[PDB]
Amino acid sequence: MDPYCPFDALDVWEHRRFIVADSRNFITPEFPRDFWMSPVFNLPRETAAEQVVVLQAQRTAAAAALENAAMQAAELPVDIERRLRPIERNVHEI
Amino acid sequence: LTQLTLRDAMGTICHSSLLDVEATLVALRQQHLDRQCYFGVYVAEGTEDTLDVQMGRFMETWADMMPHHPHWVNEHLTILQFIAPSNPRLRFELNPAFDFFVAPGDVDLPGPQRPPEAMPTVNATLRIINGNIPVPLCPISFRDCRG
């Protein structure tokens, strides 16, 4: 698991003034690596398909209530013509 | 002689430049923040599980122990250890009202459970607190006192 590197180590001392050819070192933490713990990404069990099932069941349940309300409100036009026509005839009797 | 007992600081610190986050932290951007990581700050949303082997997968990734637990959970000595540090409580301690943790990814708090390693931004959130005020120099006469 060691990355390949031909060269071991080299040395020409670090005078703060004489910095030339500005490269950048690999910045590392001071803590032992063992707690830089492992990669884990876990799925939500509710799947893109499962939410489809749940929301479709909800849509189909709501459609029944919408149809119930429509059929409750679809009888009012029958009520108007069932209630007012006899009243119009009674007025006509005069 | 003359009185000065009990009346005024209310034209006064309802004040604006304390919530303060643009330019101060700004003026000290660019380093590398001293030895400090999570203790824990990220967040999440459920766990698609049910309460007991809760036991089993939440402490056994709290499995293998670091090498010095370092800068927030002290609790027992007397006073002027506020005053010569063996011990940390001051570079996460200088004034509370802006006081500005290390801080991984604002974490898109909250989601699921399992781990990467730590990047923050810069800072804001208001410890509106000032009265066990930050701290480490104290005794028990002056607030079993306020009682």
GROMACS .gro file of N, CA and C in nm, chain B residues 6-121:
model
  348
  100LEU      N    1  -2.745   5.315   4.123
  100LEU     CA    2  -2.824   5.220   4.041
  100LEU      C    3  -2.900   5.277   3.918
  101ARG      N    4  -2.842   5.337   3.810
  101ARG     CA    5  -2.937   5.385   3.707
  101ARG      C    6  -2.900   5.370   3.556
  102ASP      N    7  -2.774   5.373   3.510
  102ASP     CA    8  -2.765   5.389   3.363
  102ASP      C    9  -2.666   5.301   3.286
  103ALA      N   10  -2.708   5.201   3.210
  103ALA     CA   11  -2.625   5.182   3.092
  103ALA      C   12  -2.708   5.155   2.967
  104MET      N   13  -2.817   5.227   2.953
  104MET     CA   14  -2.911   5.202   2.847
  104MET      C   15  -2.932   5.317   2.752
  105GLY      N   16  -2.834   5.403   2.727
  105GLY     CA   17  -2.829   5.465   2.596
  105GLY      C   18  -2.724   5.403   2.508
  106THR      N   19  -2.690   5.277   2.538
  106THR     CA   20  -2.553   5.239   2.563
  106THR      C   21  -2.501   5.105   2.503
  107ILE      N   22  -2.541   4.981   2.541
  107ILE     CA   23  -2.478   4.864   2.468
  107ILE      C   24  -2.579   4.773   2.393
  108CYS      N   25  -2.701   4.817   2.365
  108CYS     CA   26  -2.790   4.760   2.263
  108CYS      C   27  -2.722   4.764   2.129
  109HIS      N   28  -2.596   4.792   2.140
  109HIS     CA   29  -2.496   4.846   2.057
  109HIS      C   30  -2.489   4.758   1.929
  110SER      N   31  -2.431   4.810   1.819
  110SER     CA   32  -2.411   4.739   1.691
  110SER      C   33  -2.274   4.669   1.674
  111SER      N   34  -2.158   4.731   1.674
  111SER     CA   35  -2.039   4.650   1.642
  111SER      C   36  -2.000   4.546   1.748
  112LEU      N   37  -2.087   4.448   1.781
  112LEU     CA   38  -2.041   4.326   1.851
  112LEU      C   39  -2.071   4.198   1.778
  113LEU      N   40  -2.198   4.173   1.743
  113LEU     CA   41  -2.219   4.076   1.639
  113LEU      C   42  -2.122   4.136   1.542
  114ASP      N   43  -2.033   4.058   1.488
  114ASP     CA   44  -1.925   4.132   1.431
  114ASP      C   45  -1.873   4.068   1.305
  115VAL      N   46  -1.929   3.959   1.252
  115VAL     CA   47  -1.849   3.884   1.155
  115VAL      C   48  -1.846   3.935   1.009
  116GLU      N   49  -1.756   4.031   0.976
  116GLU     CA   50  -1.684   4.037   0.846
  116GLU      C   51  -1.532   4.045   0.864
  117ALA      N   52  -1.485   4.157   0.921
  117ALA     CA   53  -1.354   4.214   0.887
  117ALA      C   54  -1.246   4.180   0.989
  118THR      N   55  -1.285   4.140   1.108
  118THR     CA   56  -1.187   4.113   1.213
  118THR      C   57  -1.119   3.977   1.195
  119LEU      N   58  -1.197   3.870   1.212
  119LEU     CA   59  -1.155   3.742   1.158
  119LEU      C   60  -1.093   3.763   1.020
  120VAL      N   61  -1.162   3.838   0.927
  120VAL     CA   62  -1.096   3.874   0.800
  120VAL      C   63  -0.950   3.909   0.817
  121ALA      N   64  -0.920   4.001   0.906
  121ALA     CA   65  -0.784   4.050   0.912
  121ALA      C   66  -0.691   3.944   0.968
  122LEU      N   67  -0.746   3.832   1.014
  122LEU     CA   68  -0.654   3.720   1.037
  122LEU      C   69  -0.690   3.590   0.961
  123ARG      N   70  -0.722   3.596   0.829
  123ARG     CA   71  -0.743   3.477   0.741
  123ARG      C   72  -0.658   3.351   0.754
  124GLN      N   73  -0.530   3.353   0.715
  124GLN     CA   74  -0.484   3.251   0.619
  124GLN      C   75  -0.397   3.138   0.674
  125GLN      N   76  -0.418   3.088   0.795
  125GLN     CA   77  -0.312   2.998   0.838
  125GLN      C   78  -0.341   2.849   0.815
  126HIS      N   79  -0.394   2.791   0.920
  126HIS     CA   80  -0.381   2.653   0.956
  126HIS      C   81  -0.425   2.652   1.103
  127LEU      N   82  -0.538   2.594   1.140
  127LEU     CA   83  -0.585   2.629   1.274
  127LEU      C   84  -0.534   2.524   1.371
  128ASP      N   85  -0.482   2.569   1.485
  128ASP     CA   86  -0.399   2.494   1.579
  128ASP      C   87  -0.469   2.367   1.622
  129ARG      N   88  -0.395   2.282   1.693
  129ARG     CA   89  -0.441   2.145   1.704
  129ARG      C   90  -0.582   2.148   1.755
  130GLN      N   91  -0.675   2.125   1.664
  130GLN     CA   92  -0.811   2.107   1.705
  130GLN      C   93  -0.894   2.051   1.591
  131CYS      N   94  -0.966   1.947   1.625
  131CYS     CA   95  -1.061   1.883   1.538
  131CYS      C   96  -1.185   1.850   1.620
  132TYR      N   97  -1.277   1.778   1.559
  132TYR     CA   98  -1.419   1.796   1.584
  132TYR      C   99  -1.468   1.837   1.717
  133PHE      N  100  -1.404   1.801   1.824
  133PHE     CA  101  -1.465   1.699   1.907
  133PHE      C  102  -1.597   1.647   1.846
  134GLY      N  103  -1.692   1.730   1.801
  134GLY     CA  104  -1.789   1.656   1.720
  134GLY      C  105  -1.881   1.715   1.612
  135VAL      N  106  -1.860   1.832   1.554
  135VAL     CA  107  -1.968   1.929   1.536
  135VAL      C  108  -2.077   1.896   1.434
  136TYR      N  109  -2.052   1.810   1.337
  136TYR     CA  110  -2.146   1.773   1.230
  136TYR      C  111  -2.282   1.721   1.282
  137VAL      N  112  -2.382   1.703   1.193
  137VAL     CA  113  -2.523   1.675   1.230
  137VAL      C  114  -2.591   1.584   1.127
  138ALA      N  115  -2.708   1.524   1.164
  138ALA     CA  116  -2.782   1.436   1.074
  138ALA      C  117  -2.934   1.415   1.106
  139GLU      N  118  -3.001   1.317   1.037
  139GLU     CA  119  -3.147   1.312   1.009
  139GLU      C  120  -3.222   1.179   1.028
  140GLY      N  121  -3.213   1.111   1.143
  140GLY     CA  122  -3.279   0.982   1.161
  140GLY      C  123  -3.184   0.877   1.215
  141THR      N  124  -3.200   0.749   1.176
  141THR     CA  125  -3.086   0.669   1.128
  141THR      C  126  -3.127   0.544   1.047
  142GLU      N  127  -3.243   0.543   0.982
  142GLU     CA  128  -3.300   0.422   0.920
  142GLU      C  129  -3.268   0.295   0.999
  143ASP      N  130  -3.301   0.300   1.126
  143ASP     CA  131  -3.281   0.196   1.224
  143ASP      C  132  -3.391   0.213   1.329
  144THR      N  133  -3.377   0.149   1.446
  144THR     CA  134  -3.495   0.131   1.527
  144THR      C  135  -3.492   0.157   1.684
  145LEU      N  136  -3.379   0.185   1.768
  145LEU     CA  137  -3.307   0.193   1.911
  145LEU      C  138  -3.206   0.093   1.989
  146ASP      N  139  -3.162  -0.028   1.949
  146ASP     CA  140  -3.065  -0.101   2.037
  146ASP      C  141  -2.927  -0.135   1.975
  147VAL      N  142  -2.924  -0.209   1.865
  147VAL     CA  143  -2.792  -0.221   1.805
  147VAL      C  144  -2.748  -0.081   1.761
  148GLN      N  145  -2.832   0.021   1.794
  148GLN     CA  146  -2.786   0.152   1.843
  148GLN      C  147  -2.664   0.147   1.930
  149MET      N  148  -2.675   0.065   2.035
  149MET     CA  149  -2.557   0.022   2.103
  149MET      C  150  -2.449  -0.001   2.002
  150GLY      N  151  -2.474  -0.094   1.906
  150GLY     CA  152  -2.364  -0.173   1.840
  150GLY      C  153  -2.274  -0.104   1.733
  151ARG      N  154  -2.337  -0.026   1.638
  151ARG     CA  155  -2.266   0.054   1.530
  151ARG      C  156  -2.222   0.211   1.557
  152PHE      N  157  -2.277   0.300   1.669
  152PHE     CA  158  -2.252   0.434   1.754
  152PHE      C  159  -2.143   0.436   1.870
  153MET      N  160  -2.117   0.328   1.944
  153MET     CA  161  -1.988   0.328   2.020
  153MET      C  162  -1.864   0.253   1.948
  154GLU      N  163  -1.881   0.132   1.883
  154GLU     CA  164  -1.771   0.061   1.814
  154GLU      C  165  -1.721   0.127   1.683
  155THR      N  166  -1.785   0.232   1.629
  155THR     CA  167  -1.695   0.329   1.562
  155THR      C  168  -1.646   0.438   1.660
  156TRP      N  169  -1.702   0.449   1.783
  156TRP     CA  170  -1.622   0.519   1.881
  156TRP      C  171  -1.526   0.417   1.935
  157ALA      N  172  -1.454   0.347   1.845
  157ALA     CA  173  -1.378   0.223   1.871
  157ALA      C  174  -1.236   0.241   1.924
  158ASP      N  175  -1.147   0.313   1.852
  158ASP     CA  176  -1.005   0.317   1.886
  158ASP      C  177  -0.957   0.461   1.917
  159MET      N  178  -0.894   0.487   2.035
  159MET     CA  179  -0.889   0.614   2.111
  159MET      C  180  -0.777   0.707   2.059
  160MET      N  181  -0.794   0.841   2.058
  160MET     CA  182  -0.689   0.926   1.999
  160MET      C  183  -0.568   0.935   2.094
  161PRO      N  184  -0.467   1.020   2.071
  161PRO     CA  185  -0.354   1.025   2.166
  161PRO      C  186  -0.343   1.143   2.265
  162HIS      N  187  -0.426   1.248   2.267
  162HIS     CA  188  -0.443   1.336   2.385
  162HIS      C  189  -0.575   1.413   2.373
  163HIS      N  190  -0.674   1.393   2.466
  163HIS     CA  191  -0.800   1.466   2.442
  163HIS      C  192  -0.793   1.602   2.507
  164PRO      N  193  -0.790   1.699   2.418
  164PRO     CA  194  -0.694   1.807   2.429
  164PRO      C  195  -0.744   1.943   2.474
  165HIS      N  196  -0.864   1.983   2.432
  165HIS     CA  197  -0.885   2.126   2.451
  165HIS      C  198  -1.029   2.167   2.492
  166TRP      N  199  -1.129   2.079   2.496
  166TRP     CA  200  -1.250   2.106   2.574
  166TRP      C  201  -1.310   1.984   2.648
  167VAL      N  202  -1.269   1.950   2.771
  167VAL     CA  203  -1.363   1.905   2.873
  167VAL      C  204  -1.310   1.907   3.021
  168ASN      N  205  -1.219   2.001   3.060
  168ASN     CA  206  -1.159   2.020   3.196
  168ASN      C  207  -1.266   2.032   3.299
  169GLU      N  208  -1.232   2.003   3.427
  169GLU     CA  209  -1.326   2.045   3.531
  169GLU      C  210  -1.282   2.058   3.680
  170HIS      N  211  -1.157   2.043   3.725
  170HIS     CA  212  -1.144   2.042   3.873
  170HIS      C  213  -1.012   2.089   3.937
  171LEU      N  214  -1.002   2.219   3.976
  171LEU     CA  215  -0.888   2.280   4.047
  171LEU      C  216  -0.932   2.412   4.118
  172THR      N  217  -0.846   2.507   4.150
  172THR     CA  218  -0.911   2.619   4.222
  172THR      C  219  -0.922   2.755   4.147
  173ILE      N  220  -0.812   2.829   4.119
  173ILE     CA  221  -0.829   2.971   4.080
  173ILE      C  222  -0.719   3.022   3.980
  174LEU      N  223  -0.601   3.048   4.033
  174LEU     CA  224  -0.505   3.112   3.946
  174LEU      C  225  -0.440   3.007   3.858
  175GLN      N  226  -0.500   2.889   3.850
  175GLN     CA  227  -0.507   2.819   3.723
  175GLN      C  228  -0.631   2.861   3.647
  176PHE      N  229  -0.674   2.984   3.663
  176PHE     CA  230  -0.689   3.048   3.536
  176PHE      C  231  -0.548   3.080   3.496
  177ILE      N  232  -0.457   3.084   3.594
  177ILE     CA  233  -0.344   3.171   3.555
  177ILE      C  234  -0.199   3.111   3.538
  178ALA      N  235  -0.173   2.990   3.485
  178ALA     CA  236  -0.043   2.960   3.420
  178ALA      C  237  -0.041   2.826   3.345
  179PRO      N  238  -0.078   2.820   3.217
  179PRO     CA  239  -0.140   2.697   3.167
  179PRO      C  240  -0.049   2.579   3.162
  180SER      N  241  -0.062   2.489   3.258
  180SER     CA  242  -0.053   2.349   3.225
  180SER      C  243  -0.137   2.318   3.103
  181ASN      N  244  -0.246   2.388   3.089
  181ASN     CA  245  -0.364   2.327   3.038
  181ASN      C  246  -0.449   2.425   2.960
  182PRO      N  247  -0.536   2.377   2.871
  182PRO     CA  248  -0.571   2.458   2.755
  182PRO      C  249  -0.655   2.583   2.778
  183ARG      N  250  -0.787   2.565   2.793
  183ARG     CA  251  -0.896   2.665   2.795
  183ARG      C  252  -0.855   2.811   2.758
  184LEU      N  253  -0.769   2.841   2.659
  184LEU     CA  254  -0.764   2.984   2.624
  184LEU      C  255  -0.743   3.011   2.474
  185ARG      N  256  -0.700   2.913   2.393
  185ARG     CA  257  -0.720   2.947   2.252
  185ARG      C  258  -0.834   2.868   2.194
  186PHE      N  259  -0.934   2.841   2.277
  186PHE     CA  260  -1.072   2.856   2.238
  186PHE      C  261  -1.149   2.933   2.345
  187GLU      N  262  -1.086   3.044   2.391
  187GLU     CA  263  -1.124   3.125   2.507
  187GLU      C  264  -1.052   3.260   2.506
  188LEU      N  265  -1.122   3.369   2.472
  188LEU     CA  266  -1.074   3.506   2.482
  188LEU      C  267  -1.179   3.614   2.500
  189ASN      N  268  -1.311   3.588   2.484
  189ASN     CA  269  -1.409   3.694   2.510
  189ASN      C  270  -1.557   3.658   2.503
  190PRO      N  271  -1.621   3.550   2.539
  190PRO     CA  272  -1.706   3.478   2.441
  190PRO      C  273  -1.762   3.549   2.311
  191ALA      N  274  -1.824   3.669   2.302
  191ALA     CA  275  -1.927   3.703   2.198
  191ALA      C  276  -1.892   3.684   2.062
  192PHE      N  277  -1.767   3.685   2.029
  192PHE     CA  278  -1.733   3.625   1.905
  192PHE      C  279  -1.626   3.533   1.952
  193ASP      N  280  -1.638   3.412   1.908
  193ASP     CA  281  -1.569   3.301   1.969
  193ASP      C  282  -1.614   3.195   1.874
  194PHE      N  283  -1.519   3.127   1.816
  194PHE     CA  284  -1.530   3.096   1.676
  194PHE      C  285  -1.470   2.961   1.648
  195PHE      N  286  -1.547   2.857   1.664
  195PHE     CA  287  -1.486   2.726   1.671
  195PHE      C  288  -1.415   2.693   1.540
  196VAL      N  289  -1.338   2.582   1.539
  196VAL     CA  290  -1.310   2.506   1.417
  196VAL      C  291  -1.444   2.450   1.371
  197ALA      N  292  -1.453   2.401   1.249
  197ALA     CA  293  -1.587   2.407   1.194
  197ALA      C  294  -1.615   2.333   1.065
  198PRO      N  295  -1.617   2.203   1.063
  198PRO     CA  296  -1.635   2.137   0.933
  198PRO      C  297  -1.768   2.172   0.867
  199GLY      N  298  -1.793   2.115   0.750
  199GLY     CA  299  -1.841   2.194   0.638
  199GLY      C  300  -1.971   2.272   0.659
  200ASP      N  301  -1.972   2.367   0.755
  200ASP     CA  302  -2.097   2.429   0.803
  200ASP      C  303  -2.201   2.323   0.820
  201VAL      N  304  -2.155   2.205   0.861
  201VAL     CA  305  -2.185   2.080   0.792
  201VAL      C  306  -2.325   2.092   0.740
  202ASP      N  307  -2.351   2.042   0.621
  202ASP     CA  308  -2.482   2.062   0.559
  202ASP      C  309  -2.586   2.009   0.659
  203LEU      N  310  -2.550   2.007   0.789
  203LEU     CA  311  -2.633   1.966   0.902
  203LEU      C  312  -2.781   1.981   0.871
  204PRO      N  313  -2.861   1.875   0.885
  204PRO     CA  314  -2.855   1.731   0.913
  204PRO      C  315  -2.877   1.629   0.796
  205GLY      N  316  -2.810   1.511   0.802
  205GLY     CA  317  -2.822   1.399   0.709
  205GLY      C  318  -2.816   1.259   0.772
  206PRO      N  319  -2.745   1.165   0.709
  206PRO     CA  320  -2.713   1.034   0.773
  206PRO      C  321  -2.584   1.036   0.856
  207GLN      N  322  -2.519   0.918   0.872
  207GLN     CA  323  -2.431   0.893   0.987
  207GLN      C  324  -2.276   0.889   0.963
  208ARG      N  325  -2.224   0.835   0.849
  208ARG     CA  326  -2.083   0.778   0.842
  208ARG      C  327  -1.972   0.868   0.783
  209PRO      N  328  -1.844   0.846   0.821
  209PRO     CA  329  -1.744   0.959   0.843
  209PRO      C  330  -1.645   0.992   0.731
  210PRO      N  331  -1.633   1.122   0.692
  210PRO     CA  332  -1.505   1.182   0.646
  210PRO      C  333  -1.423   1.265   0.748
  211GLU      N  334  -1.328   1.348   0.694
  211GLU     CA  335  -1.225   1.425   0.769
  211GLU      C  336  -1.229   1.576   0.731
  212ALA      N  337  -1.191   1.671   0.822
  212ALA     CA  338  -1.254   1.804   0.857
  212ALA      C  339  -1.217   1.934   0.782
  213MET      N  340  -1.312   1.995   0.700
  213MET     CA  341  -1.297   2.138   0.650
  213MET      C  342  -1.399   2.240   0.700
  214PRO      N  343  -1.354   2.345   0.768
  214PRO     CA  344  -1.435   2.463   0.797
  214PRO      C  345  -1.425   2.585   0.704
  215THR      N  346  -1.521   2.678   0.722
  215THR     CA  347  -1.522   2.820   0.682
  215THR      C  348  -1.471   2.911   0.791
   0.00000   0.00000   0.00000
